[PDB]
Amino acid sequence: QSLTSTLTAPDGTKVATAKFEFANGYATVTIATTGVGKLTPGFHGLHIHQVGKCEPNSVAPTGGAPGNFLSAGGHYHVPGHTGTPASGDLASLQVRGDGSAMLVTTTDAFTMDDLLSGAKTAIIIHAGADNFANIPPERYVQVNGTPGPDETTLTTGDAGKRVACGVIGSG
Amino acid sequence: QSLTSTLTAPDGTKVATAKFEFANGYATVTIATTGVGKLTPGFHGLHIHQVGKCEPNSVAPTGGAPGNFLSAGGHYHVPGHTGTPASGDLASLQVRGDGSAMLVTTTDAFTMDDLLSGAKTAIIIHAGADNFANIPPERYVQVNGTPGPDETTLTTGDAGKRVACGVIGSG
Ligand SMILES: [Cu+2]
Ligand SMILES: [Cu+2]
DSSP: EEEEEEEOTTTTTTEEEEEHHHEETEEEEEEEEEESSOOOEEOOOOOEEOOOOOOOOOTTTTOOSSSTGGGSBBBBOOTTSSSSSOTTTTOOOEOOOSSSSSSEEEEEEOOOHHHHTOOOOOOEESSSSOTTTTTOOOEEEEEOOSSOOOOHHHHHHHHEEEEEEEEEEEE | OOEEEEEETTTTEEEEEEEEEEETTTEEOOOEESSSSSSSSSSEEEEEEOOOOOTTTTTOTTTSSSSSTTTGOOOOTTTTTTTTOOOOOOOOOEEEESSSSEEEEEESOHHHHHHHSTTOOOEEESSOOTTTTTTOOTTTTESSSSSSOOOOHHTTTTSSEEEEEEEEOOO
């Protein structure tokens, strides 16, 4: 009834582990650091991405300059589901002053079969906080003049670089 | 070693309960709904506010039109601490399709004595998602032209109205 992952940093060292427990039609997701000093204090975006690969200095499926864990692709969507929040979006990881963290959250947005389908999936911790695409259109505009969030914000939450990654399965 | 709270809706019905467990120099915060159908599906801002009052149609300490749980004041800051994230900021509450939710998160930003000091504190669930004041200044401006987040965003995360509130103590 469970999937797991061990998340590593770009240099290959272990950062955290995750459990995905499926029961009663939903997932209970637990993630916690395995030591100290490996994440910056504060809030970090946490999402499931659409390809089960955790390769430092890699290229995204549709192209771009290489970067950490980019071959994991974009946010995970259950087939036939578009828009925000993506199926793979999770509550943020709150990191204490010593770099340690623990989160439990729940979601009915995906199943075990979903995560094991196809190219599999990866859980990613971002460098920055997730804005959940909440950019008040009455008070903020894009630099082109359009009110509210742009496509990049809608699909990423502007959480920045990928600082830890684990493939979801049995690891 | 623990504080608790029972959170109610503006009509007085029970929505969720919370536990604040203090050990090893940090707080482990658990919050979960007590039934179904009482919060909207999706992500909800979750913060500790600076006054231990949960009054529907109330006025903020420094004034304004009445609104739900406004007498709880603004975000909680440990005395001598300013800026964002506020001491009272927590990971967001992720609500499933049926309105149910569970969150565990941790923080070293406050102690038991902090929460029991003075006018006490309240835990609040917001209607909207928290943006964590992440409004990319390279791509977004305030309508006055200044790049990045305004003071309101910095101090609230733009999470909107207060939909449930509990005073933190023994309740
Ligand atoms: Cu992500
Ligand atoms: Cu709040």
